[PDB]
C-alpha cells in the first residue's frame, strides 16, 4: 500500500496473508477470509509452479514480523481458480481457496461480508484497500497491515486511462487522479472493502494496475459483485 497508514487490530479481520514456504518464506499475496473454510483471492497468485504443501496462509496476524515457526496457519484443500482465467490477461481474476480445516471466527478472525444482491456500486463511498504490500513502487512488503482511504472511479473514467485494455463490467477501480495512494506489489488479492449500513463489504479483489500510485493510473479490482453466481456455485451454497 502506497500512501497509507498502520493498522490497528480488529479492523481488517477478514485480511489474511498467503505466503509460500520453500527454504525460506514469503508473503506473496492478499486473500479475504469469506467464511469458515473459505478465502477469496486473486487467480494470477497461483500462476507459479502449482507446487504441492507449500502454501501456508495467516489469519489473525497484524505484523509479519511477528509470525515465528510456532504461529498457526491454514493449509489449502483446493484451489478454485476461474474457468475463464487466462495468464497473460487480467480478466477474471478471481480464485477460491478451501482451507484444510475451518477456522473459528474471532475479532481478529472472521469474515468479510459479499455484496448483496440489487446494489450498485455508486452506493459505496466509503472504500478503503488493505496489504502488507510495497509501499512504493521499487520498495518491499511491510510488515503492519497497511490502510488506505480510495475512491471508487467510474468504469468510463478507468478504460480512458487504460486504453490498451478492456476495462470490463466485472472490473471495478479505484484511484485518485493526482496518485499518491494506492495497492501495490504484494497486495493483489487482497480486499477493497466499502462500508454500508455499518458493515464492510467486499466490493472489489486487487488485481492490477500499471504501477503505483501514479497519477490518472488507478488501481483495478476483480468486482467480486459480479462473480457471486460463481461463488455461491463453487461453495456449495
Ligand atoms: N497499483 C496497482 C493496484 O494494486 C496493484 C497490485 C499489484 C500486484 O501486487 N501485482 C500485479 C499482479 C499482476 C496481475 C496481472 C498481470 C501481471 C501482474 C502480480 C502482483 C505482484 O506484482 N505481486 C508481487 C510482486 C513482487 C513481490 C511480491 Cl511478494 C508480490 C500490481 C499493481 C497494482
Ligand atoms: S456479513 C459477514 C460479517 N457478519 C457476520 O459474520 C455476522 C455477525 C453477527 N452474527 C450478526 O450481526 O448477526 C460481517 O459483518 N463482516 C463485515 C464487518 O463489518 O464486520
Given at each position: ?64 514480523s ?26 477474471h ?11 473459528n ?42 490502510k ?25 477501480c ?17 480486499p ?44 456449495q451454497?
Amino acid at each position: 500500500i502506497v500512501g497509507g497508514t498502520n493498522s490497528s487490530w480488529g479492523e481488517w479481520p477478514w485480511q489474511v496473508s498467503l505466503q509460500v514456504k520453500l527454504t525460506a518464506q514469503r508473503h506473496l499475496c492478499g486473500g479475504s477470509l469469506i467464511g469458515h473454510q473459505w478465502v477469496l483471492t486473486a487467480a494470477h497468485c497461483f500462476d507459479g509452479l502449482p507446487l504441492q504443501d507449500v502454501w501456508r496462509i495467516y489469519s489473525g496476524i497484524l505484523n509479519l514480523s511477528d509470525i515465528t515457526k510456532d504461529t498457526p496457519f491454514s493449509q489449502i484443500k483446493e484451489i478454485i481458480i476461474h474457468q475463464n482465467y487466462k495468464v497473460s490477461e487480467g480478466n477474471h481474476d478471481i480464485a477460491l481457496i478451501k482451507l484444510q480445516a475451518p477456522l473459528n471466527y474471532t475479532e481478529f478472525q472472521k469474515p468479510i461480508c459479499l455484496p448483496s444482491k440489487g446494489d450498485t456500486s455508486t452506493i459505496y463511498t466509503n472504500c478503503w484497500v488493505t496489504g502488507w504490500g510495497f509501499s512504493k513502487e521499487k520498495g518491499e512488503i511491510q510488515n503492519i497491515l497497511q490502510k488506505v482511504n480510495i475512491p471508487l472511479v467510474t468504469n468510463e473514467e478507468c478504460q480512458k486511462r487504460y486504453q490498451d485494455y478492456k476495462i470490463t463490467q466485472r472490473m471495478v477501480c479505484a484511484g485518485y487522479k493526482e496518485g499518491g495512494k494506492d495497492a501495490c506489489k504484494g497486495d493483489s488479492g487482497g480486499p477493497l472493502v466499502c462500508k454500508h449500513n455499518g458493515m464492510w463489504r467486499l466490493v472489489g479483489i486487487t488485481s492490477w494496475g500499471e504501477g503505483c500510485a501514479r497519477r490518472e493510473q488507478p488501481g483495478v479490482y476483480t468486482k467480486v459483485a459480479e462473480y457471486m453466481d460463481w461463488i455461491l456455485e463453487k461453495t456449495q451454497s
